[PDB]
């Protein structure tokens, strides 16, 4: 049962990741 929970876990966080990667690419061009 632990597996089913772990897999889905790394799936939820993965979403919040691609979210910030979209916020920094906007400032970089201005800062660096």
Structure write-up:
There is one protein chain. It contains one helix and no strands. The chain has 32 residues and is mostly helical. The chain starts with a helix and ends with a helix. The longest helix is centred in the middle third of the chain and has 30 residues, at 2-31. It has one domain (1-32). This is Antimicrobial protein CAP7. It comes from Oryctolagus cuniculus.
Strand and helix map with partners:
Blueprint: H1 2-31
Protein name: Antimicrobial protein CAP7
Organism: Oryctolagus cuniculus (Rabbit)
In short:
It is classed as lipopolysaccharide-binding protein. With 32 residues, the protein is mainly α. Helices cover 94% and strands 0% of the residues.
Quick one: overall form?
A: rod-shaped
Structural class based on helices, strands and sheet pairing: mainly alpha
Taken in chain order, the helices and strands follow as H
What percentage of amino acids are in beta strands? under 5%
- Please give the number of β-strands: 0
PDB class: lipopolysaccharide-binding protein
Keywords: lipopolysaccharide-binding protein
Assembly: monomeric
Entry title: the solution structure of the active domain of CAP18: a lipopolysaccharide binding protein from rabbit leukocytes
Short key terms for the protein model shown above:
lipopolysaccharide-binding protein, rod-shaped, monomeric, 32 residues, mainly alpha, CAP18
């Amino acid at each position: 049962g632990l597996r089913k929970r772990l897999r889905k876990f790394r799936n939820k966080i993965k979403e919040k990741l691609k979210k910030i990667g979209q916020k920094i690419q906007g400032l970089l061009p201005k800062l660096a």
